[PDB]
Each structure stands twice: as structure tokens, then as C-alpha cells.
Structure 1
Amino acid sequence: SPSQVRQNYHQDAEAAINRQINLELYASYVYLSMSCYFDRDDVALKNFAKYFLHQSHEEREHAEKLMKLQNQRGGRIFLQDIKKPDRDDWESGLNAMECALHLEKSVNQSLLELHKLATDKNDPHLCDFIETYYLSEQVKSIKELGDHVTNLRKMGAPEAGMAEYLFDKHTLGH
């Protein structure tokens, strides 16, 4: 029998929120893997490491916000395994930025499908939640990553040895 607070919250939306929680946790774990990679002594880009660690924590925050939403609407959180990232070795700062861009666009696509579903179920609170706390942030993150990829490519990374070093210092070091 439904939660005492549950109103206008379709079971399909509940399931899709649980899937999105898992995806945010997965993204957090991918960024954590990237951060570990740039901390290796044979890579040693401290500001790449800092950048992706920050991203990892932000993705965890996103997941926790979705869990709060789920309880607030009277849904029930069902956690699933967090799959390991597709790679141990991220090959270069440029490659990691490109993979992060791909990841962020996949997360964005999942959010857009979630918003489609909430619109189809006439759930304006959920639509507004997604728009307010997620869509704008994704567009910003995607644009940032695209900018970084563009600059790294123009500087000549990975092959120009100086490029990732100086990008680490100037763009990611403030």
C-alpha cells in the first residue's frame, strides 16, 4: 500500500529515478578512477587529479539529491551494483577529458529521457526538479569539457609534451 506522502508519483517514474541514482553513482566511480590515474607517478598531473576528484564528489552529491527526492515523493530506493569503470588506464589528459565528455553526454541523455517520462506522466514537480537541479548543470559541464578538449587538442596534446603540463598549470590550476 502506498506511502502516506505519495501523490501523483507514477511507479515508472520511481523506477527511472532508481536507475538514474545508479547512473550518477557509476559516473562518480568513473571520475574517481580517472583521478587515481593522474595521481600515478608515471602520469603525475596533480591538477587533472584534483579536477576529476572534484567531479567524482559532485556526482555523488547528485546521486544523494536523487535519493532525497525519492524519499520526499514516497518512492522507495532500491540500490544496485555499481559497475566498475570501463578502463583502468586513461592514456592521457586529453583522452580522459574526451571520455568524460562522452560520459556527461550519456548522463544528460538519461536525464532527458527521465524528463520525457515525467512529462508523459504529467508529473510537474519531477519535471521541475530535473530542470532546476540537473539539466542546466549538465549543459554547463558538457560545455566546460568541450572547451577543455578543444584547448588540449589545439595545444598539441598528448604528443606535444608541454601541452598537458601547461594546461594542468594554467587552466586546471587557476
Structure 2
Amino acid sequence: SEELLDLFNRQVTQEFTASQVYLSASIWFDQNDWEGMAAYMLAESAEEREHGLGFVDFANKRNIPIELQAVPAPVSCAEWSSPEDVWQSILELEQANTRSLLNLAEAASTCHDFAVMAFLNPFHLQQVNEEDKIGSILAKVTDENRTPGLLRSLDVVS
């Protein structure tokens, strides 16, 4: 009932929000001549959008009415000063994406909505991989950023 439809709508918005945040990260990367890191964020921006579209398609099939919400402007990009700040906001965004999916999953569970739970399972497994991957990149960036110039090698060896 109500809470479930609402959370499924919010999930769509969270996916497109995340897509815009990834695009703001590619912009900061490009503007500061980190083309490899910018290419990476641009691909994640397309992927998040694809996840949003996948939820909209399932909702349409399941008669969960979707209504598209505004997609908020990304906010972190005004205060980024180094690749480490960007990859840190990106880790947080993925932690927020994981929480969003777990909130939706908990509502489906309370409702015994077994179809919604089955649908969510590959996304739960994807978030595990995604958080791991971004955590790992952030570790490399924070270690390499200890020697002036050395991080430019991570980007170049794309």
C-alpha cells in the first residue's frame, strides 16, 4: 500500500539524482584535466539513469503509478578541490543509493511483496560491488595523492 508506492517513486528519483551527481563529478574532472576519471563518472551517470529506467519499466508493468519528480541540482561540486573530495562524495552517494534500496526492500518485506523483493535482488548485489569498487578507487587516490604529481599517473593509465 501507500508507503511502498511512495518508496518506489523515490527510488526512481534517487537513481536520476545519482545520475546527475556522477555527471557533475565528470564535469569537475574534465574542467580540471582528469579525463580518465571524467570518462569513468560519465559512464556511471549513464548507468544510474539506466537503473532508473529499469525501475520505471517494472513499476509500469506492476501498475505502481510513477510520477516523475524534479531531479535536484547536484550540490557537492561547488566545494570539491581535489580528486579525493570528488571520489569521497561519490562513495557517500553510493552509500545513500544502497540505503534507499534497503528502505524499499524493507517496505516490500513488510508487505510480503515477493515480486518487488525478487526484482530488487540484483540491485542489492550490484550495490555491494559498486561500494567496494568506489571504496577501492578512493583508497588508491588517497594513497597516491601523497606525492605531488603521482595521482596524474592513475588518470593517464586510465
Question: What range is the shorter-chain TM-score in?
Answer: over 0.9
Q: Is the Cα contact below 8 Å between 1:20 and 1:110 reproduced in 2?
A: yes
- Greater C-alpha Rg: 1
Specify which of 89, 106, 110 is matched with residue 99 of structure 1: 89
Matched, 1:56 2:25: no
- Structure 2: segments with no counterpart, 5+ residues: none
SS of corresponding position for 1:88:
helix
* CA distance, structure 2, for counterparts of residue 16 and residue 104 of structure 1: 17
Matched, 1:111 2:101: yes
- Structure 1: segments with no counterpart, 5+ residues: 1-9
| Residue-by-residue CA offset, 1:117-150 (whole Å, 9 max, x unaligned) | 1000000110011112x11111111000111111
Specify which of 30, 33, 45 is matched with residue 44 of structure 1: 33
* CA distance, structure 2, for counterparts of residue 15 and residue 99 of structure 1: 26
Partner of 1:12: 3
Runs of 4+ in 1 over 4 A off after TM superposition: none
Output the TM-score relative to the length of structure 1.
0.86
Partner of 1:154: 143
Query: Alignment identity in percent?
Result: 28
Partner of 2:16: 25
Q: Is the Cα contact below 8 Å between 1:14 and 1:75 reproduced in 2?
A: yes
Which amino acid is the alignment partner of residue 99 of structure 1? S
- Cα offset, 1:151, TM superposition: 1.1
- Cα offset, 1:12, TM superposition: 2.6
More helix by share: 2
- Cα offset, 1:46, TM superposition: 0.5
Which amino acid is the alignment partner of residue 124 of structure 2? L
| Residue-by-residue CA offset, 1:15-49 (whole Å, 9 max, x unaligned) | 11101101111000001011011111xx1010011
Alignment root-mean-square deviation, CA: 1.2
- Range with bigger deviation, 10-19 or 20-29: 10-19
* CA distance, structure 2, for counterparts of residue 48 and residue 25 of structure 1: 20
Which amino acid is the alignment partner of residue 20 of structure 1? Q
Count of paired positions: 157
